């Protein structure tokens, strides 16, 4: 068998459809959460400072759920045995890792690790969001079977908010390098659920491949849709990594308007 | 107040894989795979093979997730569904089901296959070359379908090409039918149809004559899946009125092909 490592996107989230004011749009007068669209999920989890620190934070959609959980099933389906999980601390991508693991039947038997060391570019970040990140207790309380354990590559106070594309490649070779020296005898598959750039970013070191041109790499990290995928298989004799067919198929699907009967033939 | 509830179906995989989507999931010898995850993970066996799914696709997986985000925010709502008609598309009836299996209503309630709510036979794109699952098919493929069911329209009946005058005649008259099966007892009556049908289920409901065809036709194309129309009836008054549906609606992007051999290197 050959030991592999296989990056997913996270799912779709509440912000790419409702855009800037998703936070305003499901907050009540009184300040509590509810649904004004079905694709906002049932609830929001537990949080340091209640339902406002969700800003640079936001959680999947109901459709981003549907994906990570097929994407979890389709896993099921293919016999692949699944030997560890890593996490970008993005909510985002935490939730994603869950519903995979809950459809794999895996949720109690593998804690998800959770590594800024595969969080977004900070460039592209808010400065605060390394202070937005649900604490792995909250993350525990909200039902998340986090590993308390795990010691991350980089902690999470130790993202720089002006980090260069040059440091970001950096911490990303550095974190993939003490997650394949984990248990380097393991035969399965390590899925690392993360964004868009850490498909490019998690595998290159891997390849023994030079960091990407910055400009090409932000054209690459538009092009990847949810739960998108890229997997990478290691040669027992060499050593070497190799791009390969992910253990599943893509998912490709239709948008769902916004609409009103009664508004529409006004 | 008794209301009827009018749903379109979920996404199609026909809608987002082109009308050769069948060629892409099956073998030489009609064996089916699933080449792309919005493939179902299955198909339910047919009476004339698998050809007969080109004219009567199933939902995608992403229909699916629409129809049972819609039953379950129904169960959410607390609103008591006392029916539940599907036109005999395979599309309707999975639509139905899912819908139910989220309402934890599926074992009992009966999903009432009505032919006389099936789409206009002038979009549809065939000529003679359209069958349905029977009710025993659909029972056989874990439908809880009414076997003792009376249609409005029987199956058999439908005229193979319409013109727009004919087809709202129809849902005019298995309305009618519809609105008379149910016994007086309230709670919401589900009517599980195509875009079309929220507003020809709906007008003759309202009193209301049809619409000029133009005006009806784009209206209608803008009815995205698990779209909704819903009306309650004054009893007192004896008419119906055009409401607010019990559930919020659906938004959604779309998730594009990719392919990481062009991307990844
Ligand atoms: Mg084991
Ligand atoms: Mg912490
Ligand atoms: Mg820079
Ligand atoms: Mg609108
Ligand atoms: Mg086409
Ligand atoms: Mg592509
Ligand atoms: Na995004
Ligand atoms: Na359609
Ligand atoms: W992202
Ligand atoms: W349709």
Redesign the interface.
Known sequence: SRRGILVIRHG?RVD???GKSWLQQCTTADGKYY?????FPRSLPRRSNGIKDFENDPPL???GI??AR??G??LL?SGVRVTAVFASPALRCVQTAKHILEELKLEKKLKIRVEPGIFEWMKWEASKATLTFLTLEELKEANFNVDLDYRPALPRCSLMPAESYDQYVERCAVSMGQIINTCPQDMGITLIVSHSSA??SC?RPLLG?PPRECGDFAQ?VR?????????CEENREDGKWD?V??P???????????????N??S
């Open positions: 779709e790419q459809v409702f649904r004004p669209d079905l694709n959609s109901s459709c549907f994906q097929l994407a099933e389709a389906d498909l490019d595998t491949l690459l092009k990847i849709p949810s739960l998108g995928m890229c997997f791009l067919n992910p599943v198929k893509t998912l490709t699907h239709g948008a769902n308007s916004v609409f009103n009967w009664r529409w033939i």
